[PDB]
Ligand SMILES: [Zn+2]
């Protein structure tokens with residue numbers, strides 16, 4: 001497989017593009033502390049009540065320390081949402097919205 | 099006393115302890131039932147090294163898994179007792195195809211429903227069933243009922259807002275209720291069985307300031323439920339709004355999932371007229387739903403818990419699963435993903451995957467003309483099931499479905515109406531993505547079969563001395579070449595009998611209808627058919643010319659009456675020349691017609707032009723003279739009166755023989771208003787801009803027909819022609835956006851075509867063709883963008899909030 005190139009190596013080969021600013025930001029970030037990057041995990045489902053309670057407890061835990069990053073993952077709904085010509089008096093898109 | 103009957107509800111005992119399900123079976127005595135452990139049905143086709151890799155703890159070899167048709171070639175044509183975590187069992191020392199696959203992954207509760215019949219005479223009890231559910235509310239009345247059939251007290255929570263008395267005393271409502279109860283008694287004695295309904299229901303409205311008190315009242319109602327009866331209690335909850343909530347509130351209670359009418363008549367001080375009808379519907383529907391569930395389960399061997407409120411296509415799923423389980427091949431059903439579950443991927447995407455779902459539209463053949471003898475003909479319906487039956491006169495699944503369809507057709511004749519309903523809804527299930535066991539290949543192949551069916555019908559009509567001037571696959575339009583009189587219409591019936599008898603079909607619609615003694619055929623919405631189906635006396639009982647004129651509507655509201663009046667004048671003139679030609683014989687009639695109406699046409703043209711000379715530049719007139727903005731057309735204004743005469747030319751241009759006389763009239767008109775004898779500006783080039791969803795269906799009517807949003811009348815999109823039921827807006831927007839974006843990804847997945855050689859881009863690294871010409875292409879973005887603009891115009895026309903959101907997203 002074609003060998004890769006380090007981001008720093010790629011940058012130095014292509015030259016400066018958008019050192020003093022980068023090192024200042026690096027020093028500031030090292031000064032920065034406890035910045036939490038929280039990722040819930042793949043396929044969070046809003047339909048399930050047990051998963052809803054688990055996510056509520058997770059939000060309670062995150063309330064103690066608000067993360068500087070939070071990621072919400074794909075497939076928010078449990079089952080695929082799509083057009084329904086045989087509507088059950090309420091569109092699946094409406095449940096997805098709710 | 100203990101099971102030995104049908105189970106109304108089948109649900110998991112708990113998230114923990116997988117494989118053990120609770121049973122809500124109502125015994126011939128007092129409900130009560132349970133189920134043991136059921137293994138996780140998942141076939142990996144491999145068993146030799148399965149044991150060392152995982153503890154499957156149940157053996158199955160020699161085609162353990164099922165291969166079912168799909169895009170991957172591998173999936174094209176052993177369940178684990180414990181739900182063990184997967185541990186890379188894809189490796190297969192059996193020399194079979196690598197990969198465990200998930201061709202048959204179903205919940206065991208669904209699987210046991212698939213494996214076993216409903217009964218474990220469905221249930222002929224004299225048992226009473228409770229009838230508490232959410233009563234329909236018009237706007238915000240929050241109507242609800244806590245009613246026990248044995249309790250005799252409606253004990254409604256209806257009119258929950260205490261500020262306003264939404265619920266009426268219902269004393270006069272009660273007496274009208276009873277008098278219709280004897281009026282509707284004939285269905286009542288049938289509904290009086292299986293549940294106490296003949297009893298009069300009192301009215302006791304309860305007002306709740308806070309909804310938590312309402313929840314407490316429901317909890318206390320549940321505390322009554324299964325204690326007032328002690329044992330042997332059934333509940334009927336047909337309210338979709340509270341169907342999900344009550345199941346959580348109720349513990350181990352039994353209730354069917356089927357729904358009653360979603361809402362009642364929107365009437366809130368005068369709620370009595372609609373409360374009365376809603377409660378009548380409720381009491382009749384108790385017994386109606388009970389009997390319908392019983393007979394459908396007898397036909398289906400499925401529990402009442404099976405969902406049919408949206409459609410009985412889930413029953414179609416369970417029956418097809420049972421049928422496949424009989425054969426060596428095993429079902430592809432998958433509740434989790436409504437997409438078909440063939441092999442293990444179930445999610446592979448390629449050109450064929452989009453190919454099968456897209457372009458599922460019925461092709462239409464149109465020949466614009468005016469003819470001596472035109473018949474709109476039978477207008478065959480439900481051509482999908484007819485075609486699939488006539489095909490019997492992948493291949494294994496096709497054969498299984500054909501056998502099931504023949505079985506249902508045998509049931510569809512001289513049997514219960516449930517069999518007929520299931521036959522009608524089988525076509526919808528074949529195309530419904532929401533219904534599981536739905537294959538994109540199956541839908542595409544049924545569409546292609548209908549295409550060949552239309553082709554064979556065209557070929558059969560070709561032999562007859564008649565021409566198919568239009569083809570809709572819902573109504574088929576043919577004119578007869580001969581100028582024969584009334585006796586031909588009886589002869590037309592005889593010949594179309596002879597035509598339909600010849601092939602080996604019997605499912606197409608008979609009773610030729612809506613013959614047109616004269617038709618000026620432009621499209622679906624612009625025509626002048628006369629003397630529809632009758633005793634066929636050839637215009638004696640002349641039905642007035644039905645003429646939608648989606649282009650005439652486009653016109654300026656003041657020029658519209660003039661255009662319509664002149665088309666009646668034109669129609670009368672051609673009719674008179676038609677009797678003249680018929681008497682002469684005892685389109686030459688149209689040829690004489692042309693010279694007949696030439697002088698009035700030209701004289702009125704200039705007259706109108708001369709009037710327009712002063713008519714123009716008038717603020718009162720120009721307000722009327724402005725052409726209404728419609729989604730169909732984008733042509734220039736070009737002196738709307740000139741648009742009128744151009745439209746007249748276009749509607750006249752249909753008659754091939756008179757085209758020379760039409761040219762004479764055009765020369766006369768260009769003498770009337772200065773313009774070159776032949777001109778592109780003189781050419782019409784009318785834009786249609788038809789936005790159509792392929793094979794749209796109405797769930798109540800089950801009819802399959804393409805719906806054209808721009809061209810059809812505003813209520814025509816809303817309400818289908820077959821049944822009075824009106825399409826909901828949300829599904830309309832969903833389907834329109836479906837087609838729009840599906841075309842967008844199609845644009846993203848196209849294959850380039852060369853300039854000189856015109857080959858296809860078999861090369862990913864092309865950078866100009868290996869031919870001298872470059873890769874031209876097929877269908878770029880720009881007119882897709884103008885179609886987006888037409889979508890926006892419709893969005894102004896029709897609220898279409900989902901469409902508005904889609905447009906907003908696409909702009910970004
Ligand atoms: Zn319909």
Ligand SMILES: [Zn+2]
Pocket residue numbers: 852853854855856857867868869870871872
């Ligand atoms: Zn080339």
